[PDB]
Amino acid sequence: SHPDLNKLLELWPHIQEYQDLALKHGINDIFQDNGGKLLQVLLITGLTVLPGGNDAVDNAGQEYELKSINIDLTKGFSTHHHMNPVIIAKYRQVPWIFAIYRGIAIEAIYRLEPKDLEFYYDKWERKWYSDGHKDINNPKIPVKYVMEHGTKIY
Amino acid sequence: SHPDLNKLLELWPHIQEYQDLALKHGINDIFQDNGGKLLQVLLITGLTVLPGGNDAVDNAGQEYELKSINIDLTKGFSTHHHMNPVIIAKYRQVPWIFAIYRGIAIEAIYRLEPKDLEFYYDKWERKWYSDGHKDINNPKIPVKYVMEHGTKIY
Numbered sequence: 001s002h003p004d005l006n007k008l009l010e011l012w013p014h015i016q017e018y019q020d021l022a023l024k025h026g027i028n029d030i031f032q033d034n035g036g037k038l039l040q041v042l043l044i045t046g047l048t049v050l051p052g053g054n055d056a057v058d059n060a061g062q063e064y065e066l067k068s069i070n071i072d073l074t075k076g077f078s079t080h081h082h083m084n085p086v087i088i089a090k091y092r093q094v095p096w097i098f099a100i101y102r103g104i105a106i107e108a109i110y111r112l113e114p115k116d117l118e119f120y121y122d123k124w125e126r127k128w129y130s131d132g133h134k135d136i137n138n139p140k141i142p143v144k145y146v147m148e149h150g151t152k153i154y
Numbered sequence: 155s156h157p158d159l160n161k162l163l164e165l166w167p168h169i170q171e172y173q174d175l176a177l178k179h180g181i182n183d184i185f186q187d188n189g190g191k192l193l194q195v196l197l198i199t200g201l202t203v204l205p206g207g208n209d210a211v212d213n214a215g216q217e218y219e220l221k222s223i224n225i226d227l228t229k230g231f232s233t234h235h236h237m238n239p240v241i242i243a244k245y246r247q248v249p250w251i252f253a254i255y256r257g258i259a260i261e262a263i264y265r266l267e268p269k270d271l272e273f274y275y276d277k278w279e280r281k282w283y284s285d286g287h288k289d290i291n292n293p294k295i296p297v298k299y300v301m302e303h304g305t306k307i308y
Contacts, residue, residue, distance in 0.1 A: 001200025004175060008197045011175075012259075014168035015190070019258055021161055031190035031258055036169065043162050104173050104185055105166075 025049070034068070040106045041066065041099045044154050054094055065096040069143065072102055076140030083136050084128055088121050097153075098146045110150035117141075179203075188222075194260040195220065195253045198308050208248055218265075219250040223297060226256055230294030237290035239282055242275050251307075252300045264304035271295075 019030045022039045026049050030036035042049065047056040047064065054063035067077040077098055080087050096117065098110045124139055169184075176184050176193045180203055184190035196203060201210040201218065209220035221231040231252055234241050246268050254262040268275075278293055 002179075002197045004178070005197045007171075007175060008194065011168050011172050014165055015172055016259065017161075018165045018169055021158065021165075024158075029258060031185055031188050034185050036185035036190075040162065043156070043158050046156070104169070104183060 037068070037099075037101055037104060037106070041068070041097070041109060044106065045097065045109060047097070053090075056097065063094050065091065065094055066099065067096060067141075068099045068101065070101045070103065071107060071143065075143050077143070077146065078138050078140055081138045083124060083139065085125050088125055091117075092121060098141075098150065100143065106154065108147075108152060109154035110146050111153050112146060112150040116149045119145075191222065191255060191258060191260070195222070195251065195263065198260070198263060199251060201251070208244075210251070217248050219245065219248050220253070221250060221295075222253045222255060224257065225254050225261065225297070229297050231297070231300070233293045233295065235292045237278055237282075237293055239279050242279050246272070246275055252295075252297075252304070254297065260308065262301075262306060263308040264300045264306055266300060266304035270303045 015030075018036070018039075021043075022028075022030050022035060025039060025042050027035040027039055030039070038049070041047070042056075045056075047058055047066070049056050049066075050063070055066040056064045058064070067079070069075070069077055079091075092114055095111055095113050098112065099106055100108045100110075120139070120141060124136055128134070128136060172190070172193075173184050175197075176182075176189060179193060179196050181189040181193055181196075184193065192203070195201070196210070199210075201212055201220075203210050203220075204217070208217040210218045212218070221233075223229075223231050249268065250266050250271065252264045252266070253260055254264075274293070274295060278290055281290060282288065
């Protein structure tokens with residue numbers, strides 16, 4: 001009924017192709033849980049997403065953390081909802097990949113090394129002790145930090 | 155270059171065009187709450203989604219309930235997790251649109267009129283009293299019932 005149906009039919013073969021390319025990479029559904037966004041980070045980066053420890057691994061076995069924001073909607077990257085020195089002990093070991101989307105398109109990707117995040121890890125750990133051993137619910141990493149301190153891979 | 159990264163570059167034109175289309179119809183992000191699936195139903199059917207109540211409306215102001223099924227994963231449409239006689243009363247007023255997907259593609263759409271579903275509203279309202287005012291967790295309408303009782307739009 002919407003004449004936009006012509007358009008849909010025109011478009012549809014290419015949406016299915018884009019979804020075949022996501023299946024190839026471990027994403028079952030492009031239209032659910034930002035699946036079609038994530039495929040753009042995996043294809044530019046060459047990463048492979050890991051199932052539900054870290055989130056991605058490259059060809060050489062290096063694991064990474066992978067955090068995303070839509071910059072229209074927000075300016076800080078989330079980390080973990082209940083962090084403590086043991087989450088930080090895990091976080092201390094790997095580089096982090098930070099993907100910035102604007103809408104459905106990736107706008108930029110940054111890589112930060114553990115040395116670039118010791119700032120917040122020391123601070124968070126201190127704060128878990130000074131607040132009497134209570135878990136910090138999702139501290140955030142400002143976009144300006146990651147853009148000051150990282151390597152722009154895209 | 156990169157073989158898959160060539161495909162992103164070749165396909166992304168058409169993904170952006172499909173998202174622009176979805177904005178025209180009130181879906182903000184095709185990759186998030188099955189928004190790329192729901193757009194298919196709204197261009198075929200010509201309906202307009204509502205917020206919060208029933209799911210959609212035609213130009214004449216008739217309202218519809220709208221239910222979907224991935225035919226690869228299940229064989230019954232869900233209803234409402236807390237089924238009770240007041241929910242049923244809202245339900246009896248509107249036609250339901252059932253859309254059947256295989257994966258991310260729409261395969262079929264049926265419309266049932268309240269008379270076509272009175273069968274179930276009865277059984278459900280009676281059960282509520284008989285099992286002592288106890289709400290029903292999400293009763294299911296069998297796909298066979300809808301292929302047999304409703305009109306096939308698509």
